[PDB]
Design a protein around this nucleic acid. Structure first.
Ligand SMILES: [K+]
Ligand SMILES: [Mg+2]
Ligand SMILES: [Mg+2]
Ligand SMILES: [Mg+2]
Ligand SMILES: [Mg+2]
Ligand SMILES: [Mg+2]
Ligand SMILES: [Mg+2]
Ligand SMILES: [Mg+2]
Ligand SMILES: [Mg+2]
Ligand SMILES: [Mg+2]
Ligand SMILES: [Mg+2]
Ligand SMILES: [Mg+2]
Ligand SMILES: [Mg+2]
Ligand SMILES: [Mg+2]
Ligand SMILES: [Mg+2]
Ligand SMILES: [Mg+2]
Ligand SMILES: [Mg+2]
Ligand SMILES: [Mg+2]
Ligand SMILES: [Mg+2]
Ligand SMILES: [Mg+2]
Ligand SMILES: [Mg+2]
Ligand SMILES: [Mg+2]
Ligand SMILES: [Mg+2]
Ligand SMILES: [Mg+2]
Ligand SMILES: [Mg+2]
Ligand SMILES: [Mg+2]
Ligand SMILES: [Mg+2]
Ligand SMILES: [Mg+2]
Ligand SMILES: [Mg+2]
Ligand SMILES: [Mg+2]
Ligand SMILES: [Mg+2]
Ligand SMILES: [Mg+2]
Ligand SMILES: [Mg+2]
Ligand SMILES: [Mg+2]
Ligand SMILES: [Mg+2]
Ligand SMILES: [Mg+2]
Ligand SMILES: [Mg+2]
Ligand SMILES: [Mg+2]
Ligand SMILES: [Mg+2]
Ligand SMILES: [Mg+2]
Ligand SMILES: [Mg+2]
Ligand SMILES: [Mg+2]
Ligand SMILES: [Mg+2]
Ligand SMILES: [Mg+2]
Ligand SMILES: [Mg+2]
Ligand SMILES: [Mg+2]
Ligand SMILES: [Mg+2]
Ligand SMILES: [Mg+2]
Ligand SMILES: [Mg+2]
Ligand SMILES: [Mg+2]
Ligand SMILES: [Mg+2]
Ligand SMILES: [Mg+2]
Ligand SMILES: [Mg+2]
Ligand SMILES: [Mg+2]
Ligand SMILES: [Mg+2]
Ligand SMILES: [Mg+2]
Ligand SMILES: [Zn+2]
Lengths: 231, 118, 119, 122, 56
RNA sequence: ACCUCGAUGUCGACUCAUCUCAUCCUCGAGCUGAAGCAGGUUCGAAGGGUUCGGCUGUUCGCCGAUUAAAGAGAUACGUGAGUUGGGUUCAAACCGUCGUGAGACAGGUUGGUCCCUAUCUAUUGUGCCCGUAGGAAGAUUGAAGAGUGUUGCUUCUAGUACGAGAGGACCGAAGCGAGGACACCUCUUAUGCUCCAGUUGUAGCGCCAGCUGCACCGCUGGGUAGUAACGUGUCUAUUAGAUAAACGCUGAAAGCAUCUAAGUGUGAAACUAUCUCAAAGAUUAAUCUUCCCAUUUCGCAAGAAAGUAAGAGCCGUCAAAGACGAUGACGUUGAUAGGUUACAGGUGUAAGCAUAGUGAUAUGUUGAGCUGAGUAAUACUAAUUGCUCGAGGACU
RNA sequence: AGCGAAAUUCCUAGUCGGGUAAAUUCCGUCCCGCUUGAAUGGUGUAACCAUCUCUUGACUGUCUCGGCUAUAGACUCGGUG
RNA sequence: CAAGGAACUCUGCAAAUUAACCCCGUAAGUUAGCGAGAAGGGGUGCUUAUGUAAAAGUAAGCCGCAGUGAAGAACGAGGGG
């Protein structure tokens, strides 16, 4: 469908009080003006997408093939390049900011790389139960759980593919859907998004149109303090 | 393109901070007027009591107020920079800590804080 | 497994830093492991910058770190620090000490490091 | 958060000094009961001049919690003891008075009689 | 648990295929010429232009 | 009595579950001795769910309170190189009973050692080498896949349909939840062993004051960053296609009738997609963009001697990462780490002095002092002036 | 005689009462005690028990339900093996 | 280790509460010896003064969330075999 996408960097989390008496936790995203580096058409390519360039950097910090591509396309040198599917209607070499893309309070989804956690066990990874601690116990307390499917020639006799055991956790792309934009800050180029965004502070963040609610925009307005100077 | 994250968070918080934000220490008695909203109008409900803690930096500044009604002690956590909430410092008291937790263990004549502070 | 060695406890780590910093202030060079020099450097720099005013409060602060050495006592190390070493670093914006890597030990292959006062 | 087999006090005039939770009514494996939740209970400490007798299984609604809960504005309501009042099918209190303060979460889940018979709502 | 079948002399070498050693990077000192492993003080105590330790 | 007595550990419980349908709930439909509500039976359907306790070693079972429901089985009556040993079944002891006796009882009771460092394969993660036919740096399509799929209550529709009445809807809409899942630390909490403060004993700094070592971090009250839930955000929708049961419209064989044979429909949480993740070692090795190779001689050409670049690696500083590799940032043309400076947050008015008191101590300087990781600047220190690998693309 | 569903009762999770929201265990009682019983002793009994069994107050990570921190391992490097 | 406090399990196994000294108070039963440290409670720091051979204690004042401020000190009640 008509999917709109922007890229930014998560800077932290705060809260804002709103009319109708709710305290809304928000995530703050620093969104640089993104530059459309390429447009790929359905007829000529077999699919349609828009690839932008963001997180600008000086030319001496970029490799020779990438700077050659940037100077060939007459674009600002950036070290980050990525595309979003089904993004159409933007001319090559046009600066795009979230103000032109999304509305004041429309629903969007956000994709980001999760915070790395390393080699974690079965309980912390698959929400497994811990074995009993008292009334007599054994060496394996944080046991993963018996992986027996069948013992004997007439049964599996093997661990089934895709079993739930210990392994790497974190540093993986994850998407949280139906997040309402709260406010735009043009001067600081700063986007406010309700809820919590995955990833460490300072990581890359992709804001896209929500596929569950594409055109739904729920109104939200902030509260103006009525307090006055001390008497 | 250097990003001072703390500064940007501060700007978002300043958008909705209050002007006065009266001060109070740990052991202080304040009057908190809750602007409860029904279908119509507002009923200003007072929650006068004793402060126990004031933590936070900006829009996330919170404080704890302890009250006692009919011998039942109730503790309530308010946000300072929250609309429809008005704080009025009544008595300034002397304490030797920032989180006076013993107030939720000591009661009666032993729950009275001497005045004065510096 | 039980009856294990006490180990690299937090108290042991603080005492190790105290001993190395006292020695490096007394002699001027320390030949230790690289990972221990990289931890003693912080305390060395902190002691030197706090000993730049030479008031009795600063003596009380330093005395919680200094230890007795062969070449100086705990009271003559005080005179050496506040009158000889620290006055030299009067307008240097930090970085009074340098850590450089020597070769590996014959019996451990751990990376040695010399910690010195950067003139 | 009052849970299964939790002893709590009764804030009404009915002769029941200590009451024990049996089931957190409302769904399957409902772990906890927050303010305004209805539970099935058994009277364990009662008095001779009381409407209820020791051992009866009855239905109650909680009004206070030691753990407390947080409202939408950000205020965290926290009492110092878990208390419940005995209610009837119609959602009407069994006692004629309510002792101490009660929360505002009752107002959302009906319980208008409980609020009108309380000393002061919070 | 123990091997119910003996491992041949071929599986052993296949596992050891990753046990090979690597040659540490070396450089030339700028005041005496002998080879020293990179980013470390030479045998004369002369690192760059700074006299670090007394000569061996 | 076919395998196993040169050993196949046997009940129950815990953890992890998977599969089948003869379906407990949710979903669709036919008949009803189906007015409505609630039922009974049959057909289709396995996507998800299918509670906590008292007594007993118990499976089973009875009982209590809930739920939409508390399904039937299989997997060595799954699961002890995963846990336990309550039960059975060692040696000890007693009761009832049998025996003249030593002893015996699917009779009862008390007590009573559960070993193994994983070689192969299976599986969860992460790497090196090589291939993808010039090399390298980027961005993609997606063959074959994996993950989730639960449901309740209230209000309105509407006291309308139906029904003497009592009672009480189908369809549809909104709000609030329980369980499960993903992510995060603004709020509330837990932790926070080189943080702050209070404080006891003892030994030291020659003594007072002030600190240090030890006593669970000595103890106690708080607590930065980080890690987490008990916390708060989101999901657990929707739609399209082909259908099962079932219902069809038009229609003959069989002038009627008839859902079917031709043609044309409707139709379920099942199936294929829509949602999330990963994916060209997919050797069937894909596509696009950019960059670098395009020498002198000898002869032998995907030949030699030298000779030509993009890039990568070794080494160093590291943490958005992390067992180790790897991932990502930087290496003087630099803010990568430490130090310094300023600040935030935390702790709670520092030492010294002066006053007051006989003294413990209080008051003023003083929202003072201190501070591990946090925020940002600053080359002061450490990332040296180094080494290695690496290209002309056969022909059709 | 005394005691009795008992360290004894097969039928049997015997009947009834008490304890619990709910009690094959526990306490009292009833007695067709298949097969109790008087020095292989019978019935009571104050004190005592690293004895067995049941109810209960405080108490707590036993548990709902798992989470954080520090060491020694495990993991990486060098030596023996 | 927040809320709950045996819901865990064959069983409160293990862990947790109490713990030293001084001052009050202490039941049923009994072989009159016991039960009994029963149960249940309170105080503990520092300074000044009074007390003594030394104390203990007594009175006033001061500080802290907490004063055998850390170490070492009994969990209890009831019924039965
Ligand atoms: K056999
Ligand atoms: Mg063992
Ligand atoms: Mg253990
Ligand atoms: Mg076969
Ligand atoms: Mg097989
Ligand atoms: Mg210690
Ligand atoms: Mg060989
Ligand atoms: Mg090897
Ligand atoms: Mg035969
Ligand atoms: Mg066989
Ligand atoms: Mg054999
Ligand atoms: Mg065997
Ligand atoms: Mg075995
Ligand atoms: Mg069927
Ligand atoms: Mg499906
Ligand atoms: Mg019980
Ligand atoms: Mg069988
Ligand atoms: Mg079995
Ligand atoms: Mg089974
Ligand atoms: Mg059989
Ligand atoms: Mg097994
Ligand atoms: Mg087993
Ligand atoms: Mg074992
Ligand atoms: Mg086995
Ligand atoms: Mg046994
Ligand atoms: Mg045993
Ligand atoms: Mg025997
Ligand atoms: Mg005989
Ligand atoms: Mg495949
Ligand atoms: Mg915070
Ligand atoms: Mg002293
Ligand atoms: Mg017809
Ligand atoms: Mg269809
Ligand atoms: Mg081939
Ligand atoms: Mg830094
Ligand atoms: Mg002072
Ligand atoms: Mg007789
Ligand atoms: Mg009798
Ligand atoms: Mg018995
Ligand atoms: Mg009975
Ligand atoms: Mg038993
Ligand atoms: Mg009896
Ligand atoms: Mg006789
Ligand atoms: Mg006999
Ligand atoms: Mg005889
Ligand atoms: Mg007898
Ligand atoms: Mg004994
Ligand atoms: Mg070690
Ligand atoms: Mg080794
Ligand atoms: Mg707890
Ligand atoms: Mg509690
Ligand atoms: Mg139980
Ligand atoms: Mg159980
Ligand atoms: Mg014990
Ligand atoms: Mg007694
Ligand atoms: Mg008896
Ligand atoms: Zn040299």
């Amino acid at each position: 469908m008509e999917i709109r996408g922007i890229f930014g960097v998560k800077v932290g989390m705060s809260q804002v009080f709103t009319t109708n008496n709710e305290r809304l936790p928000i995530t703050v995203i620093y969104c640089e003006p993104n530059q459309v580096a390429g447009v790929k058409t359905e007829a000529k390519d077999k699919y349609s997408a828009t690839l932008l360039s963001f997180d600008t950097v000086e030319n001496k910090k970029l490799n020779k093939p990438q700077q050659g591509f940037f100077e060939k396309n007459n674009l600002k040198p950036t070290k980050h390049l990525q595309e979003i599917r089904n993004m159409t209607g933007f001319e090559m070499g046009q600066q795009i900011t979230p103000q032109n893309l999304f509305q004041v309070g429309e629903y969007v989804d956000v994709s980001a790389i999760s915070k790395g956690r390393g080699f974690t066990g079965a309980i912390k990874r698959w929400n497994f139960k811990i074995g009993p601690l008292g009334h007599g116990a054994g060496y394996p307390h944080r046991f993963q759980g018996s992986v027996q499917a069948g013992r004997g020639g007439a049964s599996a006799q093997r661990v089934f593919k895709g079993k739930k055991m210990s392994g790497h956790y974190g540093h993986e792309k994850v998407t949280v859907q139906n997040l309402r934009i709260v406010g735009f800050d043009e001067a600081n180029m700063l986007v406010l998004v309700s809820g919590a965004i995955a990833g460490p502070e300072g990581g890359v963040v992709l804001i896209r149109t929500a596929k569950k609610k594409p055109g739904v925009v729920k109104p939200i307005e902030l509260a103006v303090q009525t307090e006055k100077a001390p008497e | 393109k250097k990003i001072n994250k703390q500064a940007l968070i501060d700007l978002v918080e300043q958008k909705q901070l209050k002007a006065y934000v009266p001060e109070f220490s740990a052991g202080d008695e304040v009057n908190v007027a809750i602007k409860l909203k029904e279908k119509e109008k507002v009923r200003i409900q007072n929650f006068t009591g004793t402060v126990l803690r004031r933590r936070g930096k900006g829009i996330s500044e919170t404080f704890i107020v302890r009250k006692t009604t009919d011998g039942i002690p109730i503790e309530k956590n308010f946000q300072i920079h929250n609309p429809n909430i008005s704080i009025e410092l009544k008595r300034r008291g002397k304490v030797r800590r920032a989180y006076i937790s013993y107030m939720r263990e000591r009661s009666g004549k032993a729950a009275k804080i001497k005045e004065r502070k510096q | 497994s039980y009856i294990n060695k006490p180990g690299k406890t937090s108290a042991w780590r603080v005492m190790t830093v105290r001993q190395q910093v006292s020695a490096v202030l007394a002699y001027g060079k320390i030949e230790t492991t690289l990972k221990k020099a990289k931890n003693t450097q912080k305390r060395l720099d902190k002691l030197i910058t706090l000993a730049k005013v030479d008031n009795f409060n600063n003596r009380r602060q330093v005395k919680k770190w200094l230890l007795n050495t062969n070449l100086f006592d705990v009271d003559q190390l005080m005179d050496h620090l506040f009158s000889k070493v620290a006055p030299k670093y009067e307008k240097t914006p930090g970085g009074y000490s340098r850590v450089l890597k020597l070769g590996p030990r014959r019996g451990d292959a751990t990376e040695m490091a010399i910690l010195q006062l950067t003139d | 958060m009052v849970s299964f087999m939790t002893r709590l006090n009764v804030a009404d005039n009915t002769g029941a000094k200590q009451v024990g939770i049996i089931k957190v009514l409302g769904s399957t494996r409902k772990r906890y009961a927050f303010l305004g939740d209805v539970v099935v209970v058994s009277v364990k400490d009662a008095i001779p001049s009381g409407m209820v007798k020791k051992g009866q299984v009855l239905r109650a609604v909680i009004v206070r919690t030691k753990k407390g809960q947080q409202r939408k504005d950000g205020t965290h309501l926290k009492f110092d003891d878990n208390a419940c009042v005995l209610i009837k099918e119609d959602k009407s209190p069994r006692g004629t008075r309510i002792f101490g303060p009660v929360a505002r979460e009752l107002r959302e889940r009906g319980y208008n009689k409980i609020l009108s018979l309380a000393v002061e709502v919070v | 648990a123990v091997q119910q079948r003996r491992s041949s002399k071929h599986r052993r070498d296949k596992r050891r295929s990753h046990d090979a050693l690597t040659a540490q990077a070396l450089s030339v000192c700028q005041k005496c010429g002998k080879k020293k492993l990179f980013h470390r003080v030479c045998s004369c105590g002369m690192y760059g232009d700074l006299r670090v330790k007394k000569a061996y």
